[PDB]
Amino acid sequence: RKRISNCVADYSVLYNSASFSTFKCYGVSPTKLNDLCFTNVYADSFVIR
């Protein structure tokens, strides 16, 4: 679990990058991520079947 804070996050490149098999967002639209913003972001990365 990695803390992300006190920085500017550009989700447009993450969205338009084709290297991701699945990019599906639940509580927020992926398009609107650039406008609205958060107190912190958590990136839980792991590998599974």
Binding site: N16, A18, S29, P30, T31
Partner: protein, 47 residues
């Protein structure tokens, strides 16, 4: 083939937003089938 799911109302993506967009109130049917035995060669005529 993996972009077939993008052809649906309320969907977004590299295909659903740039080259082919359907209305959120789309009424109709979408029919697709693989063309691996017809279009595949390498076939570079599709962009």
């Amino acid at each position: 083939g993996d972009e077939v799911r993008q052809i649906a109302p309320g969907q977004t993506g590299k295909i659903a937003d740039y080259n082919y967009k359907l209305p959120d109130d789309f009424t109709g049917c979408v029919i697709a089938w693989n063309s691996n035995n017809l279009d595949s060669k390498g076939n570079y005529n599709y962009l």
